Symmetry: C3
Amino acid sequence: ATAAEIAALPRQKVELVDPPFVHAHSQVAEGGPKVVEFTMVIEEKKIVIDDAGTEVHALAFNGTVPGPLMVVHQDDYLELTLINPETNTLMHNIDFHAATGALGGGGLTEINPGEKTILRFKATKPGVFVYHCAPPGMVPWHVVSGMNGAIMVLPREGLHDGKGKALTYDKIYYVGEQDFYVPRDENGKYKKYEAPGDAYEDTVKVMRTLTPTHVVFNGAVGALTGDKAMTAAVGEKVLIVHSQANRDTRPHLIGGHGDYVWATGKFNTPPDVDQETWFIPGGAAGAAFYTFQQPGIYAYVNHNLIEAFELGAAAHFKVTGEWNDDLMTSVLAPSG
Amino acid sequence: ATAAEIAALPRQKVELVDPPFVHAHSQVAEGGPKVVEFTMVIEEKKIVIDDAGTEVHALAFNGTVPGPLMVVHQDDYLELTLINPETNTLMHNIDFHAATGALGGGGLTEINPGEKTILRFKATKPGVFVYHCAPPGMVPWHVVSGMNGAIMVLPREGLHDGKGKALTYDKIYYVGEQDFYVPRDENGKYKKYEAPGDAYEDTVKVMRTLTPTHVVFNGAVGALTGDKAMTAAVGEKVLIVHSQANRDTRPHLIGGHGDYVWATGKFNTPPDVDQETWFIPGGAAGAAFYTFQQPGIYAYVNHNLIEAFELGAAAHFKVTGEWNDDLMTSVLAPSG
Amino acid sequence: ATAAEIAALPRQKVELVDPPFVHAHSQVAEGGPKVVEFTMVIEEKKIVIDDAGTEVHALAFNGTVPGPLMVVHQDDYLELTLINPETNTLMHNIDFHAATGALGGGGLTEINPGEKTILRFKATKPGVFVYHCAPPGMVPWHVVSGMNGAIMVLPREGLHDGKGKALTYDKIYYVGEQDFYVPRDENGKYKKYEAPGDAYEDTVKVMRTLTPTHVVFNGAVGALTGDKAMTAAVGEKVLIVHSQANRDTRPHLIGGHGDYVWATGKFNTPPDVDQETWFIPGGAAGAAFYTFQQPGIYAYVNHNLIEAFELGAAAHFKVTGEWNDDLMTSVLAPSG
Ligand SMILES: [Cu+2]
Ligand SMILES: [Cu+2]
Ligand SMILES: [Cu+2]
Ligand SMILES: [Cu+2]
Ligand SMILES: [Cu+2]
Ligand SMILES: [Cu+2]
């Protein structure tokens, strides 16, 4: 595929939305290969991660933790414009696990504050993939400061089950799970700092215990609950993309299932079926497809329940519709 | 199906047995869909989890850690009478990962001391599934106090491998693996408590380290050894169902293999074959089918060997039969 | 086979090479079943594992951490002469996860210093498999002192994909991954000891935290980087065997992929494809097949990036050939 051929390809500017929502895209590919264009500005900002007012100096793609989901189709080109404003203090870059060469793009995208860059790569393999910042010598620090996201490379023909039947979701959500390592003082109280770099040494010591102080979805404890609870209706088919750029996770839809789960995140690997709890290793994304059958609230969790309910890794679904007494019924409600 | 059609179905009352054993069942379903009735009384009890006498207040389905294995076939209904006696001190409920709606059943089964409830759900998918107590605001604590078990939903046609060939076991065992988090004093010695609640605060601290003090099969270090060692014979086909409601495990039969392993625990997902070590993520059950070929003693372990041999996650099998020198032989015994 | 048939099989002595290199072998078996003979001498020695002079009393098959890769074909026999020199201080043995009976061989190979032993086993199942020392009552201690390696049991007809098309590698590397648990004094300085057994009690205390001090490839921080980077050329097909005898890992080729990954390490289990990050549970080996498409430096890591970049679990590949701008191009280089 020649430079001339690539330059002749149609282009499409895409407008990214904040997780857990996903920008407008089509499941089945519309026409031949294109160059899909994205722009993200890096925001270094304080985020409050729990109800005790614990802060993290987030290093945030598009200003969010996680960074937003980019959707392309197999054999499209993803062309990202990454911007590091003068109002930042650190060098940043970006590695796409979906990309091939130069460490996933990080070797070609190192930008000081004030600089920008434009990277283009061919999305040759279908699936969900992590992307994350990885500056040489400070890789884990940037990743666990929230500097990671994910992309989805859909097949041209959209999603299919193991045996070739089409799988079409009505809804898609992107859950980015984040392990945070927040230093404490001698009273076991979390510390605050004036600059990202001020926390480095204290944080690194915590990182080395391999024990996160917080494990959260969408940047904070309770982030995807209440006003930000995910929604569905009985009969709706929903795709849940889940990433974790540094640490293992075991997602589980409480009250539901993973009807089809690409646990590895890769669409050419046939999915697992009828899943109670799936497993996504650190440095990967997975995706699960589920048709809701019951109304009510669901909890969506990392099913190490200490991580879910002590450390923060719990989100809700609010589902509307009619209760099914065949699937489940209270024959005798709680009573003496 | 309608309420009338479910009412017309035959009902079978099952007598549960204590782990690692499993109640009488047939592998291939007998007749059409049944309503399968189980009763479990919750017992808040002091249990000893090691040879030193370290004690935990178990919150125990049917009085055991793990709770017993319930066995039904696909499209059967599981009807559970759950009873929380007046002598208990906490509210409990049950979540069936196999079930659909109301958080797996937890939203419909919250019973205080002196209360009972009857939950029915349709067993729509074949596999092994975790069940566990999950009271809102107190979820992980009930689980890591041993309030969990598993069920198996057999395919109506019994087990098959990935290519449609039937797999009939001679015997089945259920290994519930438990992570315990036991408070220590300033000498590093484990603390005892008067009531379940008294332990709460100290325990949650240990829980947050994500580092169990004990990792055990059937409620205690060495519980499945000595005259409680599991047993087999050369040529015998054994299904080992393994569950972990809170934390990852990596089961390994030392001296053997997992000939067919549904690592995800779901029978519609083709099993892995010829396994040395398989992986079960916290909040799931898996199952391994193995035909014994050599006599002698085997250790069945979680293959983090520190967890197996320091923390308690080791069981034995005693196997009768003739040694196969073709498979293995000492050409030269330990000698100068 | 019959007694005479086994006795009549060819015997072939093979010379081992140190990891990450692998001894001469054919992918397609050459002739009928063979008794493949190997010799390993056990070395107990102090090794430095980091840039700060930190020591471990290594317990090392063939004098290396990991022990060397042994390569046979399915239904060959592996015949190991294991030697424990009189200069050593500890009893050792060997467990092959690939073998059937006597705990994988440990029961038949317990050799005191001044002793040797010859074990033969039939390699009945194709795959990569952990081996490790395992003396009753001191199993994890020998393993986390580096006394572990792997073997590869190739299909007689070499490797295939899920469709049965041949996969032939140009090169094979073996990355053995090691969790070390090095004691520290109260100032946080790593302690040193005169003999292996002097470190035992302190080391077990560190092991029980389940938190390694170091996670390394080939026995040391940086052992497979710089001038010891592994090598390839664009268009070369490489198999990467990876083992972890005690603890989970999640291998990732930074800048590349795992085109075919036998994550379970078993060749009769179809490989996953297009992998970003794969998962190998503690107590197993896995294998990844990749065709390099881009020149330059790659980082091969455990993608818990803290383990990779704080704790030592990072390797390099140095790759020759011509850049492919179709796959990846810098449209605009880092600029103000
Ligand atoms: Cu960054
Ligand atoms: Cu990465
Ligand atoms: Cu309970
Ligand atoms: Cu659950
Ligand atoms: Cu040893
Ligand atoms: Cu082992």
